[PDB]
Amino acid sequence: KETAAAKFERQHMDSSTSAASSSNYCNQMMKSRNLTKDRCKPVNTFVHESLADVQAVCSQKNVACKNGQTNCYQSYSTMSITDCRETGSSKYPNCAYKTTQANKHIIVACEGNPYVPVHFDASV
């Protein structure tokens, strides 16, 4: 089955674009990455950076995750991100999202050897 590292890339990386280009970014990306297939995932962040720059966060500032785990890390730098969250009208299978552009630090949980992101915790 899909590894946690691979699921992170599928759910959260978009190295193909610099930022969200329209209000439909989330609607399109949530669908294309299969985040709406079984249910409408309610919130999701995409990171518009190279994969290596995001993986490097695992050697940046350690911080406890929301859930208390101690394998979270905050990026030293801000990154281009898109926040996606359901609109009031979202209703499966017609999942619908508000797209919000931002430049924020990211917090990710890391595991493995190589030690890489497995979960997106927060934009801060």
Helix (H, G, I), strand (E, B) or coil at 84: strand
Binding residues: 7, 10, 41-45, 66, 85
- Report the CATH number at residue 64: 3.10.130.10
Q: Considering its fold, how many domains does the chain have in total?
A: 1
| Alpha carbons 16 and 53: distance in angstroms, whole number | 14
What was the structure determination method?
Answer: X-ray
Which of 20, 107, 119, 121 is the catalytic position? 119
12 in catalytic set: yes
State the Cα–Cα distance between residues 41 and 96, nearest whole angstrom.
Answer: 10
What is the rounded distance in angstroms from the CA atom of residue 40 to the CA atom of residue 16? 23
Q: Which of 12, 20, 25, 116 is catalytic?
A: 12
Question: What is residue 16's DSSP assignment?
Answer: T
Cα–Cα dist 80/43, whole Å: 17
Residue 72 domain boundaries = 1-124
Decide if 105 is catalytic: no
Q: At what resolution in Å was this solved?
A: 0.9
Nearest to 117 by CA among 102, 106, 105: 106
